[PDB]
């Protein structure tokens, strides 16, 4: 698939706290939810362009994938 409606990719919210990153996904794409799980959280396999799955790396940072799937 290509880029769905709404922000298709974020800048660099990594290290900005899952909170700030989440606010960006909402203010960047009101049609996508901002999720925040630790890199490894057993979640579903299919990704939705309406859900920016942000994750946090044990390194103590927020790895927010600046690209929706």
Description of the structure:
Belongs to the protease inhibitor I13 (potato type I serine protease inhibitor) family. The modification N-acetylserine is found at residue 2. Specifically inhibits both trypsin and activated Hageman factor. Disulfide bonds join 4-49. InterPro entries: Prot_inh_pot1, Prot_inh_pot1_sf. The protein has one helix spanning 17-28; strands spanning 33-38, 51-57, 61-63. With 69 residues, the chain is α+β, with helices and mostly antiparallel strands. The chain has one domain (1-69): Trypsin Inhibitor V, subunit A (Trypsin Inhibitor V, Chain A, 2-Layer Sandwich), CATH 3.30.10. A three-stranded mixed beta sheet has the order 1-2-3, with helices on one face. A hairpin with a 3-residue loop joins strand 2 (51-57) and strand 3. The chain is globular, with a radius of gyration of 11 Å.
Secondary structure: elements and pairs:
Blueprint: H1 17-28, E1 33-38, E2 51-57, E3 61-63
Parallel strand pairs: 1-2
Antiparallel strand pairs: 2-3
């Amino acid at each position: 698939g290509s880029s769905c409606p709404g922000k298709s990719s974020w800048p660099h919210l990594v290290g900005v706290g899952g909170s700030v990153a989440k606010a960006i996904i909402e203010r960047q794409n009101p049609n996508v939810k901002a999720v925040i799980l630790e890199e490894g959280t057993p979640v579903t396999k299919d990704f939705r362009c309406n859900r920016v799955r942000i994750w946090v790396n044990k390194r103590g940072l927020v790895v927010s994938p600046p690209r929706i799937g």
